[PDB]
Design a protein around this ligand. Structure first.
Ligand SMILES: CC(=O)N[C@@H]1[C@@H](O)[C@H](O)[C@@H](CO)O[C@H]1O
Ligand SMILES: CC(=O)N[C@@H]1[C@@H](O)[C@H](O)[C@@H](CO)O[C@H]1O
Ligand SMILES: CC(=O)N[C@@H]1[C@@H](O)[C@H](O)[C@@H](CO)O[C@H]1O
Ligand SMILES: CC(=O)N[C@@H]1[C@@H](O)[C@H](O)[C@@H](CO)O[C@H]1O
Ligand SMILES: CC(=O)N[C@@H]1[C@@H](O)[C@H](O)[C@@H](CO)O[C@H]1O
Ligand SMILES: *[C@@H]1O[C@H](CO)[C@@H](O)[C@H](O)[C@H]1NC(C)=O
Ligand SMILES: [Ca+2]
Ligand SMILES: [Ca+2]
Ligand SMILES: [Ca+2]
Lengths: 705, 743
């Protein structure tokens, strides 16, 4: 009959026990009998029905009597289904005595009852005393509940909020929490608001990108890089020793023209904007958190102590952090190296290197997860919440290093401290430092960033959950068993599913916020991913997993400190990216200072001759201070070559030393860093303190009541 | 009512069994008043209604006629138990137990009740009676209720209302039973004869309540931390002083063969001539004293010290909050709308006034220096600096009162809803005004003095005819130190003298207006009526002065390592000064309770945050350590220098720039130099290319090297300091472990 009620009886099930009979080594049967007798004596109903499919598997079900169940529910601080008390029985309207309770809360109370009893959930499940135990879903998600009394909340919830037919509709948070629990509701609300503000971020980013894209005609330095009589005549020095010849500058028109898009004033404006956008996001999330705290029953008290089966060396963890970061850097370096040792060509090279690095990161993620689990379990935590917090911190640190090591290397430690061709830097010995092209490494930073974000999102939840949908779409266009057996045939979601989902969104937030300067279109990718992910998570949760007992929570949890830390780090990261990764500061300094008769020869500020007047000069006769075999020998009548660094020309009294322009530029860079950081922090503080002038609605009405 | 009994010190009713709690003082109609007898009718009717309501509510009260003046009538008060217990229950007043609750009659037997009248301390009785007096209503006119004892005095119905002191501070109470605890407080706490013994905060709380005990405990903890700071600062200064044989650049400046030959270049237009660098040997030695690595050590030590002070203060606050069992009363909070009450324009106008205040401060300092220099024609230069600082401080003190008055008027235009709103608005506005007024000159000296003046060929004028002033080769750090020490010391001395004197002289005037030959013994209430009132603001000005002192100690310590010693002397005097003025020259303030110091806490956190920026900027720009280090590490070497190994030798000569006298352009005042015709080139403090050269007088490589070093130092210092402070805040539990046990 696929009913939710006891056999031939009016009694609503709330939780199921399934055990494997040993009668087809009696210790397991003895433990089972003891547990069952204890449950019977403690005042719970029990009924067993054998599944037709497997005679070995025998299922057991329970119920909830009003008196004892309500008493134990009042045992802990439970509000209206304001601790429960018969003295306020008629204060609140009640239409019936058998259904007024929320079935989710009934399941939660029964689960707590089972947890408190001892002798079994943990030990019996782990050791095989009981195969599994879970509550029931209202009905099949395909078709409405056959029983009229059932509201078929699962059917409506699926059809309205899980199927991608409702991709555009609004999020029904009330049903989400009233069916699943407070944790799921708060997670989905946070995800929704995050998408909402990602919309504004995406609009602003698109505006800036268009502003850049319409400036291609007025991008002087790229034009000069292309004009053959200027770009082609420049002969750059080789970037390696034994496998690179002298190259003309104009071979990088495509790179420079693309780079002028992501290296314009629009990016600077967008970085400044995101600086305050992050603060606004935090402030309004506190708004919404207060609002949900008021509107929902989020005033549940916390128990002082909890029990766990397990009831410094932290330096070892940080050593693992260091080795992980070093491994990531070596992985990226080796990937680019192997792709090298073998219009599009350089772009395809960069894309392939990024793809290989992303693959290696994907493999490394599982290993890092396993080692984090092992090490944290070796610590013997006292409780469960502390266990989750320790996992959050350690897992997040591993993911952070594993995913951002290559990006940090590209941004900062690539082409920054390479000496002039006369005395190259071999920091470790026989390991030369890589150099960026004259434009900079910003373009490959953007390529790595976009490839990683895309690949991760697309491959992960997206692709894993999405095969059947595309299969059915292509197909279209181009024995009856009770509910408990069906739910048994499902698979559980474990105890870390919500943790993993939050981890994914937090990694996405880090990608969007940290390196926003390089890639102004990142918010658009994040928005698309979120719009799909909300429905993917909803569908998987409501279709492919057993029902989870609702829990009580008031905030996302351990992540808010991580969010604010990410914001405080992101401001400085963006400042450093604009200062060092990009070549906007040298360009501005040249335009304002070195185009004037004292140093230049133009009658007015202009960008003409920036490329020629910026690149340095090197002499072959001074090939090396070590005076060994040199790659400069022969190879034509070449006598002078140029390199991307600010040093005095040969013959100057300060031979091959940093010149005035270098120090002017570095001073400008440091001034920009300090001014931008101070202004952004000041605005952050003002906005945070302006809660009364920003947030007069939510707190006022929440305190009014 | 009934006449004077004959026992002066007695604080009881004429029977001797009822303890007084308040004295209401009104002016009778017995005289021949003028204007309206109707005004007298209304005043007497209102007074009668209020007294009738109070006597109905359950408070006894009997009056008496003053012996000296016939027109003075004193009205006593008294609260029997029943009303006392009921109102304590309404107030959530807790009593000593022996899992904690306020006082209720239902649990009357559950408390350690000692005696009829003794179980309740007089301070709490006074507070309860004060609330009873405040909440009551007396009449309704224009269909709108009129209530509040405060309004009666505001409109002039009552002269005053106050509790009573135990007995004379300088003699014991004639009544044996009386504790005379005022006597003990005077003997031990006030009366600087006990300058050293630790102040008994418990008795202070008992007598004057928590509102005063919190302030005095804060001051004591402040003083101890200043002892630590003064020891460390004296150590740093002593090291700087004993290390002078190795201050090379000062030796070069003083040396007649190096410094003497440097023919510097005139600063002014034509009122000051050429001069030789060796005339600044005294200033060079002073800067060696004040501008050593000890200054950096003290800057970083103070950066840590401010945070440590804040955290330990939080721990002490928690400890005291538990010890004085203020949790339930702190939770029980209710605010009453102001008795006086019945856009962004106010804020913007306030900000404009702030800007003009800053400009006025800068201008007054500049004019003081200018006039002290003009009047010219034991070092003459230092004498001039001291004089300038003296006039600057005089003008600052004069302008402080005007700024206080303007703040009061501005905050009065806006109508804060309750007393707390008014107090917080006043706190913010007064702090901003005092900050700007006191520190505008110091900020100018530190950051805007001799920083954007061009080379002599093309002098920089701010807006015309106003040439920018510039420092000597060493810098203006010594000028800043002189300004700071003079202003801080003068503020301390003048403020302490004013605090000690003004109430005393007012009391003396009042007494000399009553030289009537009483030659008798007079009652307690009548004698306590003559003391000063301690206007409703209260400890606001005390907190303000202490906050300004802390700002001086912390913000600018990078230029004056001896500031904590001056602060220590000031505070060890101020403890007893404030105690004496509060115990011997003022009527008993009504007790209350407070969570913390008040609105000042955000001010202190802001000051601590901005101190790091101020110190970093001072060391980077005001001082000259950074150019010295740059020269030592990167310009005494073959690429630019000549010395084989790093050294400070030849720093003065190799740094001072050059200028060719005939190269003066511009048509106005063509003859600032050519008059003498002695030489053809002068040296000035700036990094620019020498004559000739493709870029004649543009900034050279050394300038940009130095600027980059300065900015890098700022970044590194700010980041490390803030990171260390954040980590320290995270690590400190912020509550005592013992208190964690007790709670
Ligand atoms: C058009 C033009 O002047 N291009 C300059 C050239 O004059 C100069 O000799 C060279 C190296 O300094 O850099 C380039
Ligand atoms: C292009 C060119 O002439 N480069 C010069 C070379 O001629 C000269 O022999 C060498 C040493 O002086 O310095 C370099
Ligand atoms: C106070 C001082 O240093 N005075 C000296 C002076 O004695 C010396 O004759 C002159 C020439 O170098 O330089 C200056
Ligand atoms: C120790 C000494 O006198 N040094 C001076 C300096 C001056 O800037 C330079 C002028 O060329 O002449 C040197 O002799
Ligand atoms: C001592 C010295 O430097 N004298 C020169 C002078 O001969 C020249 O006529 C003038 C013009 O710039 O510059 C200066
Ligand atoms: C670069 O310049 C050289 C000579 O100026 C030339 O012939 C070539 O076509 C230009 N473009 C590329 C992509 O090499
Ligand atoms: Ca997912
Ligand atoms: Ca004082
Ligand atoms: Ca004082």
């Amino acid at each position: 009959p696929d009913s939710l009620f006891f056999t031939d009886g009016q009694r609503r099930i709330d939780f199921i026990l399934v055990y494997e009979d040993e009668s087809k080594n009696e210790k397991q049967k003895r433990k089972r009998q003891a547990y069952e007798s204890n449950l019977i004596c403690h005042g719970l109903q029990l009924e067993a029905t054998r599944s037709v499919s497997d005679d070995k598997l025998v299922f057991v079900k329970v119920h909830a009597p009003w008196e004892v169940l309500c008493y134990y529910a009042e045992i802990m601080h439970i509000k209206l289904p304001a601790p429960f008390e018969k003295s306020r029985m008629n204060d609140f309207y009640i239409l019936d005595r058998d259904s007024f309770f929320n079935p989710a809360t009934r399941s939660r109370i029964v689960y707590f009852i089972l947890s408190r009893v001892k002798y079994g959930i943990n030990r019996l499940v782990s050791s095989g005393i009981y195969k599994a135990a879970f509550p029931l879903h209202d009905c099949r998600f395909n078709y409405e509940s056959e029983d009229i009394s059932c509201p078929s909340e699962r059917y409506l919830l699926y059809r309205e909020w899980a199927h991608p037919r409702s991709i555009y509709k609004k999020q029904p948070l009330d049903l989400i929490r009233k069916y699943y629990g407070e944790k799921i509701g708060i997670y989905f609300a946070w995800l929704g608001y995050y998408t909402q503000m990602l919309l504004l971020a995406a609009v602003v980013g698109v505006a800036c990108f268009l502003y850049g894209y319409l400036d291609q005609d007025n991008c002087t330095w790229s034009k000069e890089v292309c004009d053959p009589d200027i770009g082609g005549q420049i002969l750059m020095c080789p970037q390696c020793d034994r496998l690179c010849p002298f190259w003309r500058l104009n071979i990088t028109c495509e790179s420079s023209k693309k780079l002028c898009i992501f290296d314009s004033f629009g990016t600077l404006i967008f970085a400044v904007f995101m600086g305050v956008w992050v603060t606004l996001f935090l402030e309004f999330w506190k708004r919404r958190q207060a609002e949900l705290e008021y509107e929902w029953d989020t005033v549940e008290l916390q128990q002082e102590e909890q029990a766990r089966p397990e009831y410094a060396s932290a330096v070892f963890f940080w050593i693992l952090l260091i080795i992980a970061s070093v491994i990531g850097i070596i992985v990226y370096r080796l990937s680019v190296f192997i792709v090298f040792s073998t219009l599009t060509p350089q772009m395809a090279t960069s894309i392939t290197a990024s793809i290989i690095s992303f693959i290696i990161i994907m493999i490394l993620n599982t290993i890092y997860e396993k080692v984090a689990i092992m090490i944290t379990n070796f610590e013997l935590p006292r409780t469960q919440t502390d266990y989750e917090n320790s996992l959050t911190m350690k897992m997040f640190l591993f993911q952070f290093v594993n995913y951002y090591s290559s990006c940090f290397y590209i941004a900062f430690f690539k082409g920054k401290f390479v000496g002039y061709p006369g005395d190259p830097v071999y920091l470790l010995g026989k390991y030369r430092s890589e150099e960026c092209d004259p434009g900079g490494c910003l373009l490959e930073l953007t390529t790595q960033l976009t490839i990683i974000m895309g690949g991760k999102a697309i491959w992960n939840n997206i692709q894993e959950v999405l095969l059947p949908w595309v299969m059915n779409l292509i197909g279209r266009y181009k024995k009856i068993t009770p509910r408990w057996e069906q739910d048994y045939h499902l698979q559980p979601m474990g105890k870390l599913g919500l943790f993993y989902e939050y981890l994914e969104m937090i990694i996405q937030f880090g990608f969007v916020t940290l390196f926003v300067a390089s890639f102004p279109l990142a918010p658009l990718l994040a928005l698309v991913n979120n719009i799909l992910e909300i429905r993917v998570d909803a569908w998987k949760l409501t279709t492919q997993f057993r029902r989870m007992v609702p829990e009580k929570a008031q905030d996302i949890g351990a992540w808010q400190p991580i969010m604010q830390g990410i914001a405080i780090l992101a401001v400085v990261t963006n400042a450093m990216i604009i200062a060092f990764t990009s070549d906007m500061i040298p360009r501005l300094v040249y335009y304002w200072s070195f185009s004037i008769p004292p140093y230049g020869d133009h009658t007015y500020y202009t960008m003409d001759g920036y490329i020629n007047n910026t690149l340095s000069v090197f002499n072959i006769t001074d090939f090396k201070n070590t005076d060994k075999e040199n790659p400069y020998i022969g190879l034509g009548n070449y006598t002078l070559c140029r390199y991307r660094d600010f040093r005095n020309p040969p013959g100057h009294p300060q031979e091959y030393k940093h010149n005035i322009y270098y120090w002017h530029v570095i001073a400008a860079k440091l001034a920009f860093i300090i001014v931008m950081e101070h202004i952004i922090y000041s605005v952050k503080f003002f906005i945070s303190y302006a809660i009364p002038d920003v947030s007069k609605i939510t707190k006022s009405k929440i305190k009014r009541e």
